[PDB]
């Protein structure tokens, strides 16, 4: 037999609208329609009737726009931050195929869609045909990106760090805030060198902080290891950095989203000496999604 | 523009720094095994010969004689105060001291060779470590002629 009815959602701007991609578990790449905070969502719910002869008794049909955050793969932890409802039909019957119009006016979408380890933030349309014991339910996913402009203030990061009477260095990155296809332009400057350095590298590190207060879990992932020096420098030696972020497709920094989770990026400078001892300093950088002109 | 050739401005290196000798020189050689004593109280000693230009060490060159217990004494001193996860020694070989083996026991040439190389392996890792150079036991071990 199969199903009696199949629900299909089709957006009014389903040809012209731009789509986007999402990396999910084990390398899979989904593709869904892209939306922005403030945009109206509208289209059609199309019920295809599959068993001609039979009839479908229901106690209402609705469509919902939903944006929600899911934690630790646990259904009971899901929190909807946006829910809108449109009732499409009163309790009735369906004998044949039919379609319904819906429009959500100027929909608030305060957060950017994200898929991580312990956190998912996703938007979707959900159609529900209510029945006596089991509802027919159809989800229809959407990407939402959040845009920004060039920041008012964007100070360079500049600091002296070291190991007293072994290694003193001064590092500098050209900005604090980099867009997703920006370039880390920087330099390392050696003021005192009394160890034998094998190589130096710059690492881009992504931290996913979940939970509230002492209930805090941090998932770390090293997105890039970029060697910037090979060999033992002496004092007065400068080392240029030019690290293109386009090569690593990172997500924006996301800070205390709905007071539930954070995603933060760090530049971890690492020197390694001849006996494999490893000296490091970590600096946060805000990544942001640049509004195209 | 076809290429992003951006770099930060760099200060020219002073020529005395460019060409002057580097300030990270440190090599320690464990060498020349000798038997001290006769009969029951015999033990092997090795010449620990250092060369350096680091200002924390008192002598730029030194030569001293050490025992395998002196290496064990150093490792126990560092494990307590230093908070440096210390690398291992080549091993206390108790079963070689037992009598009537099919080799010369603790005075076997292949044993002494491998032991000797393991001491050099140990002492270079420890003496190059930043936090270990602050401890007085390392300078006592390397450069005072008796501990």
């Amino acid at each position: 037999f199969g199903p009696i009815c199949e629900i299909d959602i089709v957006l009014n701007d389903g040809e012209t609208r731009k789509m986007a991609e999402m990396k999910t578990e084990d390398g899979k790449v989904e593709k869904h329609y892209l939306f922005y905070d403030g945009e109206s969502v509208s289209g059609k719910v199309n019920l295809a009737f599959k068993q001609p002869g039979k009839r479908l008794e229901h106690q209402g049909i609705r469509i919902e726009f939903v944006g929600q955050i899911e934690l630790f793969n646990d259904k009971s932890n899901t929190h909807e931050f946006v829910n809108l409802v449109k009732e499409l039909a009163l309790p009735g019957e369906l004998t044949q195929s039919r379609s319904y119009d819906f429009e959500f006016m100027q929909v608030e979408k305060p957060y950017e869609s994200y898929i991580g380890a312990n956190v998912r933030l996703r938007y979707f349309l959900k159609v529900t045909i209510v029945r006596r014991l089991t509802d027919l339910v159809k989800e229809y996913d959407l990407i939402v990106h959040q845009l920004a402009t060039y920041p008012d203030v964007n100070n360079s990061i500049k600091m002296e760090v070291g190991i007293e009477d072994c290694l003193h260095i001064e590092f500098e990155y050209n900005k604090s805030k980099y867009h997703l296809k920006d370039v880390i332009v920087g330099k390392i400057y050696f003021l005192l060198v009394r160890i034998k350095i094998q190589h130096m590298e710059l690492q881009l590190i992504k931290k996913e902080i979940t939970g509230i207060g002492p209930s805090t879990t941090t998932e770390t992932e090293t997105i890039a290891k970029y060697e910037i020096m090979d060999g033992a420098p002496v004092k007065g030696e400068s080392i240029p950095i030019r690290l293109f972020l386009a090569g690593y497709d990172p997500t924006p920094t996301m800070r205390d989203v709905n007071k539930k989770f954070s995603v933060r990026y760090f530049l971890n400078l690492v020197l390694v000496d001849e006996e494999d001892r490893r000296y490091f300093k970590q600096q946060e950088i805000i990544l942001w999604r640049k509004a195209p002109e | 523009t076809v290429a992003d050739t951006r770099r930060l401005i760099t200060k020219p290196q002073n020529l005395n720094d460019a060409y002057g000798p580097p300030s990270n020189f440190l090599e320690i050689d464990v060498s020349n095994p000798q038997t001290v004593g006769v009969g029951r109280g015999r033990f092997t000693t090795y010449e620990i010969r250092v060369k350096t230009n680091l200002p924390i060490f008192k002598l730029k060159e030194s030569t001293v004689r050490r025992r395998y217990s002196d290496f064990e004494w150093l490792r126990s001193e560092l494990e307590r105060e230093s908070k440096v996860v210390v690398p291992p020694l080549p091993g206390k070989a108790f079963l070689r001291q037992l009598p009537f083996r099919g080799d010369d026991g603790i005075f076997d040439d292949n044993f002494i060779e491998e032991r000797k190389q393991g001491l050099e392996q140990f002492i270079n890792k420890v003496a190059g470590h930043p936090l270990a150079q602050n401890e007085r036991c390392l300078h006592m071990f390397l450069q005072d002629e008796i501990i």
Binding site: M159, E160, V161, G162, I163, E164, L167, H168, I169, L191, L192, D276, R277, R278, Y279, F280, K281 | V84, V85, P130
Partner: peptide, 15 residues
């Protein structure tokens, strides 16, 4: 296994 060492900040110290 690998010995990590955080590089300390240096305050009001010139070269």
């Amino acid at each position: 296994q690998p010995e990590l060492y955080l590089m300390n900040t240096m305050s009001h110290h010139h070269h």
